[PDB]
C-alpha cells in the first residue's frame, strides 16, 4: 500500500511513494492537486525505474540533494534520487544495489540517525541465511550481519 | 537450541504414472487457488516412476480413491528444530534416531527442514532426545511445554543433469500458472532423469526443476541464488513401501550442506555442484568395509 | 451477396453438470493452449439443463466416452454470408422443406450448421439470391412439431466480449476458477465460449464481470448490455420460431443455440418490444 514521507530537513517537500515515485511541494499561493483552503500542491518530478517495489525510506545526512532508498521483492535496495541532482560534493553515491546472496522479499528499511552511513535491511526467511544485515553506502559484503533462520519484520533504532 | 512438534498431521499416498488425468480438477485448485480449500500443507514432486503427494487431512477429502492410488498406514506427524546448518541438524537427529531404529523421512525446503515422523514413535522419540536442545509442543501462538514427568542397499544412480533449487512469489504465482501447468501433466508423452518438485508450506514456496526447464519461464521474475550454482543429485533406490538414514549416515561425517528430499520408493539427496569427486568417492569407501 | 461452405466437419456433444470433473482434462487442454491441440473451432456454452460442446473431429479425437457424455449421429457444417437481411433472407426460407437449422453467433462474425445428409436440399434453395462458394484446399472454387414452447424471461443481465489471444494467460486462472469450480423464476446461470480460426467471443453477465481488471477486455465502448429470452425444446424448425416471427419486427439478434434449447438477446433499451413482439400470441 502507498505511504507517505516527509523529508527530513525540508518545510515544504513531500513524497509520494506508490507504483511510481513523485515528488510534490506545498505551494503557499493562497493570496496567489488541492490540499486546503490554504495551500496545494505542485509537481517537481517523478521516477518510475523500480517496478515492484516494497518498502522506502528517506536519507538525512544533509543534502547528497535527495536521496531515496527503496528495497526490491527480490531483496535487493537500490538507492534513488529526485530533484535537481547537481553540485554536490558527494554525487557517487546513486545507482549502487546491495545484492544479498540469496532472494528473498524485502521487509523493513531504516537509517542510523547518529551516522549517516548505516542502512539496515530485513528479509525474509531461509534455511542458511543471515536474516538481517547492516550495509554500508561508502557491494558484495555487508557490514555486520545478525540471525541466522528466522524473519525480521520490522526494524527501529534506539536512539542511545 | 529448540525442537518444536507442529500440528500439522500429514497423510501420505503415491499416483501412479499413467493415469494421474483423474487427478487434475484437485491439484490445481490447490496449487494455484488458495482460497477453495482449507488444508495448509502442500508439497509434491514426480519422478520416472511415479506420483508422491504429501497433504493434511483438510485436503485428503478432495481426493477421490481410484485404484489408481495407493495411500498408507499410519498418519504421519511433523517435528521442526531451530536455533545449525544442515550437517548439525542431520548429525543430531537422523543418526541418533537411527541408533534404536524408529525411521523417518526429511523433506527440506528453501525455507526450512521438516521431519515427518509416524504416530507410534512419539512416546520413543521424545524419549530418545529430551538430553538435547529444548523440546515444546506448539499449540496456539505460544507453544506449550513438554515435560518429562514420567516415560519408561542398492549403488548409487546419479543423474547426470543439473539443477535448480528456487522459490516463488505468491502474489506472482497466476502470472505463470499456464506455462507451470503445461509442465507438471501436459508435457508428459540413461544420462539423464526427470524431476519436479512442488511445495506450498504455509505461504512459502519451494520448488525443484531440471535447468534445461528453467528456460521456459521468464528471468527477472524468478528467485534463485545470486551468482547461479546449480546443484547434482544421487539417486538411491528401495522396496515398495528406512532408506535416507543409510544415504545420510554415511554422509554425516563432512561438512557438506546435504538437501534431502523422500518419495515411496526413492530416497534422493543433492549437494552443490563445484565439487562432486568428495560426495561420489566418500559413500563408495562407506560401502566397502561397512557393507561386508 | 456470396455464401460460402467452410471446411470444418462439426460434432455436438453435451456433457452433463455433475460430471464434469472427469472431463476437466481435455476442456483446459482446448481452451488455453494453442500449440498443444490442432483444432480450429471450438465452442462452449453454459446452461442450468447441462453443458454443450461443439468440437471438430480432430477435438472429437480427445474425449474419454463415459457414461455422462450424449452425442448426436449426424454432422453439421459450417455456412456463411460474407459479401438485418439474415433470418429474412436464410433462415426464414429454412424452414419451408423441412430442414433445421442450428445458429451460433459470435463478437467477429455470424455462423449457421446445416445437417449433415441435407447437403442436396440446403444450396436448393438459397441459390436463387446468391451465387454459391466452396472453399476448397484454401482456394474458394466457385462451381456447381405445432408444440408451442412457452417462453422464459430471465431478469438477468448479459455482456459481449473479445480479449486479444496474447494476453490470454493472464486471465486463465480466473476463469478456470469460473467454469469448475465457483459452481458449487430467475438468476438463470449462462456462459458462453468461442474458439473459432483463431478467434474469441464470449458472453458473460454483468455481475461476474466486475472480477476481471476492468481494461484488458475488449467491449463496447458505453457499455450498453443485452437481455435475453429462451425457448426449450425437445430435440437431439425449433430456432425458427423465435427468429421467424421476430424478423417481421427486423430487429437485431445475436442468437446462440444448444443442446436443447434456443436463446436470443437484445439489446437493453428496447425488450419493452421485443417482449412485445411474440405477445402478439402466436
Given at each position: 500500500k502507498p505511504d507517505i514521507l516527509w523529508a527530513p530537513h525540508h518545510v515544504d517537500r513531500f513524497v509520494v511513494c506508490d507504483s511510481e515515485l513523485s515528488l510534490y511541494h506545498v505551494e503557499s499561493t493562497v493570496n496567489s492537486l488541492r490540499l486546503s483552503e490554504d495551500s496545494a500542491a505542485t509537481l517537481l518530478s517523478i521516477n518510475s525505474?523500480?517496478?515492484y517495489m516494497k518498502c522506502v525510506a528517506w536519507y538525512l545526512?544533509?543534502?547528497?540533494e535527495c536521496l531515496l532508498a527503496v528495497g526490491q521483492a527480490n531483496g535487493r535496495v537500490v538507492l534513488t534520487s529526485l530533484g535537481?541532482?547537481?553540485?554536490?560534493?558527494?554525487?557517487?553515491?546513486?545507482?549502487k544495489e546491495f545484492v544479498p546472496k540469496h532472494a528473498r522479499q524485502c521487509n523493513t528499511l531504516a537509517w542510523n540517525?547518529?551516522?549517516?552511513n548505516w542502512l539496515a535491511a530485513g528479509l525474509d526467511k531461509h534455511?542458511?541465511?543471515?536474516?538481517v544485515l547492516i550495509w554500508d553506502?561508502?557491494?558484495?559484503?555487508?557490514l555486520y550481519e545478525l540471525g541466522q533462520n528466522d524473519a525480521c519484520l520490522s526494524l527501529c533504532w534506539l536512539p542511545r | 537450541m529448540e525442537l518444536h512438534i507442529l500440528e500439522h498431521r500429514v497423510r501420505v499416498l503415491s499416483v501412479a504414472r499413467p493415469?494421474?488425468?483423474?487427478?487434475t480438477h484437485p491439484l490445481i485448485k490447490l496449487l494455484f487457488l488458495?482460497?477453495?480449500?482449507?488444508?495448509?500443507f502442500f508439497s509434491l514432486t514426480e519422478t520416472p516412476e511415479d506420483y508422491t503427494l504429501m497433504v493434511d487431512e483438510e485436503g485428503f477429502k478432495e481426493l477421490p480413491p481410484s485404484e489408481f492410488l495407493q495411500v498408507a498406514e499410519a498418519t504421519w506427524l511433523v517435528l521442526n528444530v531451530s536455533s545449525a546448518g544442515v550437517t548439525k541438524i542431520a548429525r543430531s537427529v537422523i543418526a541418533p534416531l537411527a541408533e534404536h531404529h524408529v525411521s523417518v523421512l526429511m523433506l527440506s525446503t528453501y525455507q526450512t527442514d521438516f521431519i515427518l515422523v509416524r504416530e507410534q514413535d512419539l512416546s520413543v522419540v521424545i524419549h530418545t532426545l529430551a538430553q538435547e536442545f529444548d523440546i515444546y509442543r506448539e499449540v496456539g501462538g505460544e507453544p506449550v511445554p513438554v515435560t518429562r514427568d514420567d516415560s519408561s542397499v542398492h549403488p548409487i544412480q546419479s543423474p547426470q543433469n543439473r539443477f535448480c533449487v528456487l522459490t516463488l512469489d505468491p502474489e506472482t504465482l497466476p502470472a505463470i500458472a499456464t506455462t507451470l501447468i503445461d509442465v507438471l501433466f501436459?508435457?508428459?508423452?540413461p544420462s539423464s532423469i526427470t524431476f519436479f518438485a512442488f511445495s506450498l508450506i504455509e505461504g512459502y514456496i519451494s520448488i525443484v526443476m531440471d535447468a534445461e526447464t528453467q528456460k521456459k519461464f521468464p528471468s527477472d521474475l524468478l528467485l534463485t541464488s545470486s551468482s547461479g550454482e546449480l546443484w547434482r543429485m544421487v539417486r538411491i533406490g528401495g522396496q515398495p513401501?528406512?532408506?535416507?538414514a543409510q544415504i545420510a549416515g554415511p554422509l554425516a561425517a563432512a561438512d557438506i550442506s546435504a538437501y534431502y528430499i523422500s518419495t515411496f520408493n526413492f530416497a534422493h539427496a543433492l549437494v552443490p555442484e563445484d565439487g562432486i569427486g568428495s560426495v561420489i568417492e566418500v559413500l563408495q569407501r562407506r560401502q566397502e568395509g561397512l557393507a561386508s
Open positions: 525505474d523500480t517496478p545526512n544533509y543534502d547528497p535537481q541532482d547537481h553540485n554536490s560534493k558527494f554525487k557517487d553515491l546513486i545507482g540517525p547518529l551516522d549517516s534455511r542458511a541465511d543471515f536474516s553506502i561508502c557491494v558484495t559484503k555487508p | 493415469g494421474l488425468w483423474l487427478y488458495p482460497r477453495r480449500s482449507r488444508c495448509k501436459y508435457s508428459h508423452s513401501l528406512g532408506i535416507v
